[PDB]
Amino acid sequence: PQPETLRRYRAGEPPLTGSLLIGGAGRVVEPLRAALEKDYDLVDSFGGLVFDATGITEPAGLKGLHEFFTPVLRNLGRCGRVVVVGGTPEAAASTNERIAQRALEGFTRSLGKELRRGATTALVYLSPDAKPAATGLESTMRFLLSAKSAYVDGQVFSVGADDSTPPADWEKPLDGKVAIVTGAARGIGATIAEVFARDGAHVVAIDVESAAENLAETASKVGGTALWLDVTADDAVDKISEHLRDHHGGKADILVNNAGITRDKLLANMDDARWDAVLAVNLLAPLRLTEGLVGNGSIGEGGRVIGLSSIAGIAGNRGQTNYATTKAGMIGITQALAPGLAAKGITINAVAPGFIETQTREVGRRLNSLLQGGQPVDVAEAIAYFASPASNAVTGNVIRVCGQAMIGA
Amino acid sequence: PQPETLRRYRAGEPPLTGSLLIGGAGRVVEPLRAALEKDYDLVDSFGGLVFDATGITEPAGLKGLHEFFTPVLRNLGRCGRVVVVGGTPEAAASTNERIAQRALEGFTRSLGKELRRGATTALVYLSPDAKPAATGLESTMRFLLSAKSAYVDGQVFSVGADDSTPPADWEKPLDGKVAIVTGAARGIGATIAEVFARDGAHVVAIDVESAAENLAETASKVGGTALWLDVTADDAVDKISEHLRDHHGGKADILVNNAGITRDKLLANMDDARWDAVLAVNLLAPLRLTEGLVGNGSIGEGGRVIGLSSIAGIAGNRGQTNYATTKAGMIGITQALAPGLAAKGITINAVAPGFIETREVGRRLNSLLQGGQPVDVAEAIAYFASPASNAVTGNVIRVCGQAMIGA
């Protein structure tokens, strides 16, 4: 009983390898069909199973989940996508509807732990205030119903009421956009830059001076520019804005707060410098860069801020009272600023990676529904989803990229 | 690292095994000191370490956690208690403060994973509209700072703004209260009935007809009354109301929705009966009983509803799409009904047990290195049931020894 080689994004291929079945009842089934009609193969294997649960307003109606899924799970293909779409529970028209809509999460997390051959589950809630066409839902569904979401599993997405505008080209969604990526010389940051450039964006790649030639290498590979910077410095916002003005028209559309450090130590053995330095790089700097780049006009309307939280921030981790406080605080930034940024036309989100390959580890690779570690592209893809200019109805969200890792809160 | 023999509640014993250090800065350290002064040993080990974080309004201020805890952890006693008290992040007076208070949860859960010898952590949030005396905070701090909270670890408790009255005797907190406990013939339900009776309550023990014999025994052993019936039936609310009318002036103070069943099957193989039975017992019935008993005034002002969720309903489990959906549903009832019930002076909360002895892998995969005991789940429920926990509602607390599994 072993790990599937996971399907990942490749130019030119259809989003799903099988057909797309949209079932259930409520307000989303018909407009989603109309929207996905021309790029997806509507009803082969099922590449995708979508259930509209928005019509379920009492716990007695949860039966529809069973009635829809049980006959069709046999036909779900390799790396197939299961998504349940509900109404935001707090916004339901009754306490019965709230209970039912909330119950949907026990279902989708459980079904993630049953699906085979790299297939995944997700739960998406849509505001009851979205218009009937649900154009604000489309970027979320397109990311989920595709190879891009390869390592995102068992999670919950929250879409608001606003309408969206599709990008000129769904395969080039970040075309014309300027994106700043911190910690961009290596690892996940370098890959965010890559996936960003692939989607059409011009990247400002930031890292510390010691990451020298590595930062130039990334910058060259992605067709962007290298900016050598300590993000904790008093003058970081000024220097970032100066580079924007000198090389990118004074604006950025996107900021990815990817740079991060660990200094693991048990609390009983913790020193001031290890606490402070991790707090400075991981929490204080992304807060200062977000408030300062928005505040000086560098990032404005249509803007996107994505932070890197992590599983240790949600579940805790031994020797990481410093790091986990900062990753929990990243979630705080994301939740606290979302209402203010909305008022300025900016979204803010966070991606929380689990076990991702590449510079005990055995357990860490195995302990998830997908039976394997993730790849840096898997995290980059979740982050580009949020960066989309059609993702304006997504804000306040924290999405683990973890293979449905067992560990949590 | 070996598992510790966990200290559990026994009468006449001190709540903590060493002294109680209360530190930090904000609106809570002083009034909390004043409240716990006569019943605790304020400052031989530390039996408890409480840090007031409410003063922290910026991320730069989180260093106070370390400055408080780091020097004193050396002396934290066996089965010791660490609690950080913060201010509800949603209610913060600035986005900086929300961010800093939100961040406290990475801190308490990571520290849960470091603490040795049985000792546990908790985060408590207190509404910024609570009065300076913080009397609504007292039931939660007293549960946490005692042996009763033995298997609760790494969790997050949410206290509102309302004042509270202490019971006449903190050791008999449910004296003169009437409690309905479903699924009470055996197991966790029978133990809830016992702990309730220990705490001075009159228990109305409910279970099914086939359990009539076992239910009678339990009722006699706790000094309560048995009432067998099928909680799914059209007449359940009537039979219970009728029973209350007879024995307890038509009124119950507490309802515990403990009855629940599993019919495990992968969804690909799920049949109608296995889905429907599990939904009916575990979700439909508790809801209908709550709404019914509230609806006819059997549960009124001072009321307490407590539901059994479980870790399955939070994290999911293979072969439990039915049972998980019901247990997430119980969290749904908790959260959805809290606002309207609060207007009637009733709280509603849920406990979500982890691995409880009643196999090798789930026993050990928690910070406490051991499975729980049915008493540990009972205590959590009795904590919410308290007449002094009226400022505690809409909470979901796991009783899992800080099991690694989660969402």
PDB file of C-alpha atoms in Angstrom, chain B residues 37-177:
ATOM      1  CA  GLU B  37      -4.610  33.567  47.690  1.00  0.00           C
ATOM      2  CA  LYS B  38      -6.561  31.584  50.313  1.00  0.00           C
ATOM      3  CA  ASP B  39      -6.942  28.283  48.340  1.00  0.00           C
ATOM      4  CA  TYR B  40      -3.455  28.162  46.740  1.00  0.00           C
ATOM      5  CA  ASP B  41       0.096  28.568  48.010  1.00  0.00           C
ATOM      6  CA  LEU B  42       1.130  31.861  46.281  1.00  0.00           C
ATOM      7  CA  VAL B  43       4.739  32.971  45.573  1.00  0.00           C
ATOM      8  CA  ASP B  44       9.041  23.031  47.578  1.00  0.00           C
ATOM      9  CA  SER B  45       8.399  23.153  43.769  1.00  0.00           C
ATOM     10  CA  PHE B  46       6.136  25.256  41.521  1.00  0.00           C
ATOM     11  CA  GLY B  47       2.814  23.430  41.158  1.00  0.00           C
ATOM     12  CA  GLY B  48       1.707  26.177  38.767  1.00  0.00           C
ATOM     13  CA  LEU B  49       3.131  28.941  36.584  1.00  0.00           C
ATOM     14  CA  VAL B  50       0.635  31.497  35.301  1.00  0.00           C
ATOM     15  CA  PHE B  51       1.695  34.307  33.015  1.00  0.00           C
ATOM     16  CA  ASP B  52      -0.507  37.292  32.322  1.00  0.00           C
ATOM     17  CA  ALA B  53       0.013  38.135  28.606  1.00  0.00           C
ATOM     18  CA  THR B  54      -2.836  40.585  28.382  1.00  0.00           C
ATOM     19  CA  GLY B  55      -0.365  43.502  28.720  1.00  0.00           C
ATOM     20  CA  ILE B  56       1.310  42.506  25.434  1.00  0.00           C
ATOM     21  CA  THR B  57       0.028  44.753  22.683  1.00  0.00           C
ATOM     22  CA  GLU B  58       2.813  44.410  20.109  1.00  0.00           C
ATOM     23  CA  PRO B  59       4.851  41.525  18.622  1.00  0.00           C
ATOM     24  CA  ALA B  60       8.024  43.134  20.138  1.00  0.00           C
ATOM     25  CA  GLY B  61       6.506  42.391  23.546  1.00  0.00           C
ATOM     26  CA  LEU B  62       6.285  38.590  23.173  1.00  0.00           C
ATOM     27  CA  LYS B  63       9.771  38.285  24.698  1.00  0.00           C
ATOM     28  CA  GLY B  64       8.099  38.650  28.070  1.00  0.00           C
ATOM     29  CA  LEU B  65       7.024  34.976  27.693  1.00  0.00           C
ATOM     30  CA  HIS B  66      10.601  33.858  27.661  1.00  0.00           C
ATOM     31  CA  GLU B  67      11.731  36.346  30.326  1.00  0.00           C
ATOM     32  CA  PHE B  68       9.078  34.918  32.642  1.00  0.00           C
ATOM     33  CA  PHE B  69       9.203  31.138  31.889  1.00  0.00           C
ATOM     34  CA  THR B  70      12.816  30.409  31.019  1.00  0.00           C
ATOM     35  CA  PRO B  71      14.321  30.992  34.598  1.00  0.00           C
ATOM     36  CA  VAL B  72      11.551  29.150  36.432  1.00  0.00           C
ATOM     37  CA  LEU B  73      10.910  26.006  34.356  1.00  0.00           C
ATOM     38  CA  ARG B  74      13.744  24.221  36.256  1.00  0.00           C
ATOM     39  CA  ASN B  75      11.448  24.129  39.242  1.00  0.00           C
ATOM     40  CA  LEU B  76       8.116  23.208  37.721  1.00  0.00           C
ATOM     41  CA  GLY B  77       6.775  20.298  39.697  1.00  0.00           C
ATOM     42  CA  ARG B  78       5.593  16.884  38.538  1.00  0.00           C
ATOM     43  CA  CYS B  79       2.096  17.181  36.925  1.00  0.00           C
ATOM     44  CA  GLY B  80       2.644  21.008  37.112  1.00  0.00           C
ATOM     45  CA  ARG B  81       0.439  23.519  35.276  1.00  0.00           C
ATOM     46  CA  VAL B  82       1.479  26.281  32.906  1.00  0.00           C
ATOM     47  CA  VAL B  83      -1.265  28.731  31.839  1.00  0.00           C
ATOM     48  CA  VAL B  84      -0.865  31.835  29.742  1.00  0.00           C
ATOM     49  CA  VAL B  85      -3.778  34.265  30.026  1.00  0.00           C
ATOM     50  CA  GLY B  86      -4.268  36.545  27.036  1.00  0.00           C
ATOM     51  CA  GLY B  87      -6.955  38.881  25.716  1.00  0.00           C
ATOM     52  CA  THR B  88      -9.423  37.560  23.045  1.00  0.00           C
ATOM     53  CA  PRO B  89      -7.645  38.372  19.834  1.00  0.00           C
ATOM     54  CA  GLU B  90     -10.761  39.284  17.825  1.00  0.00           C
ATOM     55  CA  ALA B  91     -11.579  41.886  20.501  1.00  0.00           C
ATOM     56  CA  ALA B  92      -8.079  43.532  20.582  1.00  0.00           C
ATOM     57  CA  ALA B  93      -7.853  47.287  20.603  1.00  0.00           C
ATOM     58  CA  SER B  94      -5.312  47.354  17.707  1.00  0.00           C
ATOM     59  CA  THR B  95      -4.193  45.014  14.885  1.00  0.00           C
ATOM     60  CA  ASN B  96      -0.789  44.786  16.659  1.00  0.00           C
ATOM     61  CA  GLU B  97      -2.407  43.464  19.766  1.00  0.00           C
ATOM     62  CA  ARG B  98      -4.578  40.927  17.849  1.00  0.00           C
ATOM     63  CA  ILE B  99      -1.437  39.653  16.106  1.00  0.00           C
ATOM     64  CA  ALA B 100       0.492  39.337  19.399  1.00  0.00           C
ATOM     65  CA  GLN B 101      -2.380  37.685  21.305  1.00  0.00           C
ATOM     66  CA  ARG B 102      -3.108  35.319  18.293  1.00  0.00           C
ATOM     67  CA  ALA B 103       0.685  34.330  18.349  1.00  0.00           C
ATOM     68  CA  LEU B 104       0.378  33.059  21.995  1.00  0.00           C
ATOM     69  CA  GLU B 105      -1.119  29.804  20.767  1.00  0.00           C
ATOM     70  CA  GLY B 106       2.064  28.782  18.846  1.00  0.00           C
ATOM     71  CA  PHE B 107       3.847  29.377  22.174  1.00  0.00           C
ATOM     72  CA  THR B 108       1.590  27.312  24.492  1.00  0.00           C
ATOM     73  CA  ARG B 109       1.296  24.295  22.131  1.00  0.00           C
ATOM     74  CA  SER B 110       5.030  24.209  21.462  1.00  0.00           C
ATOM     75  CA  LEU B 111       5.713  24.429  25.189  1.00  0.00           C
ATOM     76  CA  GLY B 112       3.211  21.578  25.831  1.00  0.00           C
ATOM     77  CA  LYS B 113       5.625  19.426  23.812  1.00  0.00           C
ATOM     78  CA  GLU B 114       8.637  20.262  25.964  1.00  0.00           C
ATOM     79  CA  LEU B 115       7.272  19.978  29.496  1.00  0.00           C
ATOM     80  CA  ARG B 116       8.264  16.911  31.480  1.00  0.00           C
ATOM     81  CA  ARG B 117       6.835  14.733  34.242  1.00  0.00           C
ATOM     82  CA  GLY B 118       3.115  15.102  33.564  1.00  0.00           C
ATOM     83  CA  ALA B 119       3.032  18.922  33.449  1.00  0.00           C
ATOM     84  CA  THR B 120       0.666  20.508  30.856  1.00  0.00           C
ATOM     85  CA  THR B 121       0.047  23.881  29.228  1.00  0.00           C
ATOM     86  CA  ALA B 122      -3.118  25.880  28.524  1.00  0.00           C
ATOM     87  CA  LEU B 123      -3.947  29.162  26.889  1.00  0.00           C
ATOM     88  CA  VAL B 124      -6.835  31.135  28.319  1.00  0.00           C
ATOM     89  CA  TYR B 125      -8.276  34.173  26.492  1.00  0.00           C
ATOM     90  CA  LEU B 126     -10.358  36.674  28.564  1.00  0.00           C
ATOM     91  CA  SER B 127     -12.706  39.203  26.940  1.00  0.00           C
ATOM     92  CA  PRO B 128     -11.340  42.814  27.304  1.00  0.00           C
ATOM     93  CA  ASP B 129     -14.893  43.667  28.594  1.00  0.00           C
ATOM     94  CA  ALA B 130     -14.516  41.551  31.717  1.00  0.00           C
ATOM     95  CA  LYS B 131     -14.483  43.600  34.907  1.00  0.00           C
ATOM     96  CA  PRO B 132     -11.073  44.099  36.614  1.00  0.00           C
ATOM     97  CA  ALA B 133     -12.013  41.568  39.365  1.00  0.00           C
ATOM     98  CA  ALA B 134     -12.245  38.927  36.531  1.00  0.00           C
ATOM     99  CA  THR B 135     -14.697  36.809  38.481  1.00  0.00           C
ATOM    100  CA  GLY B 136     -15.807  35.032  35.294  1.00  0.00           C
ATOM    101  CA  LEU B 137     -12.215  33.687  34.888  1.00  0.00           C
ATOM    102  CA  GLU B 138     -12.129  31.916  38.224  1.00  0.00           C
ATOM    103  CA  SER B 139     -13.885  28.536  37.301  1.00  0.00           C
ATOM    104  CA  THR B 140     -11.456  28.039  34.367  1.00  0.00           C
ATOM    105  CA  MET B 141      -8.312  28.862  36.351  1.00  0.00           C
ATOM    106  CA  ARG B 142      -9.421  26.570  39.136  1.00  0.00           C
ATOM    107  CA  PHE B 143     -10.111  23.649  36.788  1.00  0.00           C
ATOM    108  CA  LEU B 144      -6.726  24.150  35.083  1.00  0.00           C
ATOM    109  CA  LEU B 145      -4.783  24.656  38.380  1.00  0.00           C
ATOM    110  CA  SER B 146      -5.816  21.277  39.854  1.00  0.00           C
ATOM    111  CA  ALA B 147      -5.539  17.553  39.283  1.00  0.00           C
ATOM    112  CA  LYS B 148      -8.961  17.454  37.566  1.00  0.00           C
ATOM    113  CA  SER B 149      -7.414  18.804  34.364  1.00  0.00           C
ATOM    114  CA  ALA B 150      -4.896  15.864  34.217  1.00  0.00           C
ATOM    115  CA  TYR B 151      -5.457  14.950  30.556  1.00  0.00           C
ATOM    116  CA  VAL B 152      -6.180  18.429  29.041  1.00  0.00           C
ATOM    117  CA  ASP B 153      -3.067  19.767  27.398  1.00  0.00           C
ATOM    118  CA  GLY B 154      -2.092  22.342  24.823  1.00  0.00           C
ATOM    119  CA  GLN B 155      -5.651  23.554  24.609  1.00  0.00           C
ATOM    120  CA  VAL B 156      -7.304  27.052  24.268  1.00  0.00           C
ATOM    121  CA  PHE B 157     -10.118  28.272  26.514  1.00  0.00           C
ATOM    122  CA  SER B 158     -12.283  31.294  25.801  1.00  0.00           C
ATOM    123  CA  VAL B 159     -13.803  33.324  28.692  1.00  0.00           C
ATOM    124  CA  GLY B 160     -16.238  36.072  28.027  1.00  0.00           C
ATOM    125  CA  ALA B 161     -17.040  39.362  29.771  1.00  0.00           C
ATOM    126  CA  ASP B 162     -19.787  38.351  32.303  1.00  0.00           C
ATOM    127  CA  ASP B 163     -19.250  38.320  36.107  1.00  0.00           C
ATOM    128  CA  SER B 164     -19.559  35.004  38.049  1.00  0.00           C
ATOM    129  CA  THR B 165     -20.594  33.888  41.552  1.00  0.00           C
ATOM    130  CA  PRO B 166     -18.492  31.160  43.184  1.00  0.00           C
ATOM    131  CA  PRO B 167     -20.363  28.056  44.243  1.00  0.00           C
ATOM    132  CA  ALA B 168     -20.880  27.766  48.060  1.00  0.00           C
ATOM    133  CA  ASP B 169     -18.174  25.078  48.046  1.00  0.00           C
ATOM    134  CA  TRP B 170     -15.689  24.746  45.216  1.00  0.00           C
ATOM    135  CA  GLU B 171     -15.282  21.060  46.172  1.00  0.00           C
ATOM    136  CA  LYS B 172     -19.044  20.464  45.697  1.00  0.00           C
ATOM    137  CA  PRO B 173     -19.661  22.843  42.731  1.00  0.00           C
ATOM    138  CA  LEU B 174     -22.818  21.106  41.418  1.00  0.00           C
ATOM    139  CA  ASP B 175     -24.547  20.826  44.898  1.00  0.00           C
ATOM    140  CA  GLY B 176     -28.309  21.163  44.346  1.00  0.00           C
ATOM    141  CA  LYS B 177     -28.004  21.049  40.488  1.00  0.00           C
TER     142      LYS B 177
END
